[PDB]
Amino acid sequence: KPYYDVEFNYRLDPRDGGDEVIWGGTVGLMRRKYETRTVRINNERGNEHNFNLDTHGFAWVKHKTSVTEFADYLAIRQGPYYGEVAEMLKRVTGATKVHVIGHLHRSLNYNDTTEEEKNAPDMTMTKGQTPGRFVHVDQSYQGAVRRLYLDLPQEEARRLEKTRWAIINVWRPVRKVTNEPLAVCDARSVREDELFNTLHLVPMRWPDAAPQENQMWAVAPPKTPTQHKWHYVSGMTEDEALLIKMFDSKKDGTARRVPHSSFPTPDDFGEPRASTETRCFVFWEDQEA
Ligand SMILES: [Cu+2]
Numbered sequence: 001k002p003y004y005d006v007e008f009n010y011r012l013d014p015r016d017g018g019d020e021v022i023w024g025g026t027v028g029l030m031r032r033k034y035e036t037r038t039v040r041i042n043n044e045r046g047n048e049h050n051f052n053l054d055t056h057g058f059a060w061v062k063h064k065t066s067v068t069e070f071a072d073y074l075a076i077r078q079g080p081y082y083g084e085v086a087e088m089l090k091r092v093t094g095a096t097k098v099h100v101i102g103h104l105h106r107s108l109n110y111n112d113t114t115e116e117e118k119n120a121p122d123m124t125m126t127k128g129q130t131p132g133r134f135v136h137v138d139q140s141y142q143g144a145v146r147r148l149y150l151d152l153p154q155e156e157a158r159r160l161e162k163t164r165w166a167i168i169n170v171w172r173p174v175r176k177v178t179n180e181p182l183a184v185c186d187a188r189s190v191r192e193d194e195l196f197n198t199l200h201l202v203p204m205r206w207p208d209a210a211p212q213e214n215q216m217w218a219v220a221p222p223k224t225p226t227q228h229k230w231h232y233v234s235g236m237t238e239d240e241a242l243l244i245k246m247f248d249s250k251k252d253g254t255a256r257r258v259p260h261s262s263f264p265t266p267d268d269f270g271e272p273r274a275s276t277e278t279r280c281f282v283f284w285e286d287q288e289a
Pocket of ligand 1: 132137
């Protein structure tokens with residue numbers, strides 16, 4: 001199939017009853033009201049090579065992992081996965097340094113979890129993670145700088161900030177994707193004025209810790225199905241990776257931030273999609289910030 005036309009969840013402005021906060025990981029977020037717009041998502045299977053991190057802000061690569069068990073967070077963190085991703089991402093970006101910080105495992109079906117969690121209070125967390133079915137970038141420009149100075153030692157962050165740096169997510173499915181694929185939006189098809197600084201809060205270890213804080217970009221709805229240039233690749237497997245630029249310090253033409261969203265298709269079948277996304281800092285220490 002060459003494309004789908006599907007409903008996407010975009011920003012509801014507070015003056016029309018929109019919330020200020022994304023309560024990431026919670027049952028409530030699945031009941032959040034949005035500005036829904038139908039958008040066209042173009043299938044790029046057979047045409048991956050025409051997308052790259054500099055122009056569009058994303059790239060599909062051939063890359064195998066020796067890891068098949070993503071359920072144990074600590075086991076992922078202590079194994080070879082992070083080093084695998086770092087070596088690959090260093091080679092694709094021509095970077096001088098790559099720091100792999102963390103990952104998120106996704107394995108819950110959105111529809112099934114909606115049905116399962118009907119009696120769950122809003123701020124209760126799901127038993128694992130749903131697909132990210134809303135249009136966002138993981139870090140704002142401010143969010144990107146917060147993440148640098150919290151995930152790196154302060155002295156390194158001060159130094160590396162002086163040279164070009166980016167945040168890139170590496171998205172890999174556990175097995176062939178036959179439901180709820182991930183869509184990525186051409187960085188150039190969204191304008192600065194459509195981007196809105198939005199608190200993302202995750203109530204981990206409530207009540208012993210304050211929710212984990214991030215500053216993401218929410219996105220204003222388009223006026224047309226094709227104004228935002230949406231893209232996915234069908235049947236993506238564990239032998240493939242999607243690199244998504246959340247942030248780049250470069251202020252020339254270079255793609256700086258990619259709105260992404262999961263979406264259901266009418267052809268969805270099989271076991272719930274599962275994926276991991278690993279958040280990486282990329283450094284070119286031989287380049288102006
Ligand atoms: Cu995301």
